[PDB]
């Protein structure tokens, strides 16, 4: 049933719960909002991709991320990829908060909708991650009989030379290992979902509007007593999220920047110094190349 585990529906209450013996396994669900401070735009933000796709003359915005349209007309996607590719990938304070969760032995799994690989770079291992919508890191030829793999460097050279990536062997289109709209999510998503959520003690949802399915429905996969904290610029997910009704008993919305939310939560736990050290050290290591 609906056991009440938080004393109060606040970030403070969440911290107090996290400090209790009951909280052993945390699952993070994250989206584009945790990477916007790194310089990568999201979908919906009033800066968002969906507000700046006019120049591509699409039948509709989401078409640029739809598999059928991509296969017929890959050019807009790769043009957008040329424009959006950051000079360098650095993880945000949020990513490193998840890394810190890993180091504290609290992180059961991070489910990510993002394709920027910043979770890996932040130091989360493949075991710690479920990359629900794939990754830009590796790419594959679309031919079923060939399925040739291509590294990020090859793809970046293709993209920056404004040449549509074609397989050097079978000449088929080469597509980043991203799950486009209309494609199936990886099996790992469903298997991991079937195993992890029966033992999750806390759901931490960060930087997502919870619009894309079936990822959003993950929030309904948690036990009814499992507290769920949203750190996001606006409320989302309303077995959906219930922050404000009289029946609210386990859901908390902290509204603001993800980095600031993670800093605040870290502070409440006495982890702020640790987090800041982690971020600075890792950033320095990355800059040192």
């Amino acid at each position: 049933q609906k056991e009440r585990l938080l004393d109060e529906l606040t970030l403070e209450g969440v911290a107090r719960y996290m400090q209790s013996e009951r909280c052993r396994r945390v699952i993070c669900l994250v989206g584009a909002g945790i990477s916007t401070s790194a310089g990568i735009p999201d979908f919906r933000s009033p800066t968002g991709l969906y507000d700046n796709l006019e120049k591509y003359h699409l039948p509709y915005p989401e078409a640029i991320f739809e598999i059928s349209y991509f296969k017929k007309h890959p050019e807009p996607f790769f043009a957008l990829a040329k424009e959006l590719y950051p000079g360098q990938f650095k993880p945000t304070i949020c990513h490193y908060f998840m890394r810190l969760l890993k180091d504290k032995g609290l992180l059961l799994r991070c489910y990510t909708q993002n394709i920027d690989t910043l979770e890996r770079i932040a130091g989360l291992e493949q075991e710690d991650l479920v990359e629900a919508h794939g990754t830009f890191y590796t790419s594959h030829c679309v031919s079923a009989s060939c399925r040739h793999e291509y590294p990020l460097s090859w793809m970046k050279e293709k993209i920056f030379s404004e040449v549509t990536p074609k397989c050097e062997d079978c000449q088929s289109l080469v597509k980043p290992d991203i799950v486009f709209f209309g494609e199936s999510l990886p099996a790992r998503f469903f298997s991991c979902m079937q195993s992890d959520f029966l033992k999750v003690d806390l759901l931490l949802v960060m930087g997502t509007s919870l619009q894309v399915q079936p990822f959003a429905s993950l929030i309904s996969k948690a036990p009814l007593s499992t507290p769920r904290l949203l750190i996001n610029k606006e409320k989302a997910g309303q077995g959906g999220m219930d922050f404000d009704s009289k029946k609210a008993y386990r859901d908390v919305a902290w509204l603001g920047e993800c980095d600031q939310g993670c800093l605040a939560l870290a502070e409440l736990l006495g982890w702020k110094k640790e987090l800041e050290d982690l971020v600075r050290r890792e950033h320095a290591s990355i800059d040192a190349q």
Binding site: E62, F180, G182, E183, S184, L185, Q211, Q213, P214, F215
Partner: peptide, 5 residues
């Protein structure tokens, strides 16, 4: 409601 099946 966008969908990746």
């Amino acid at each position: 409601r966008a969908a990746x099946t």
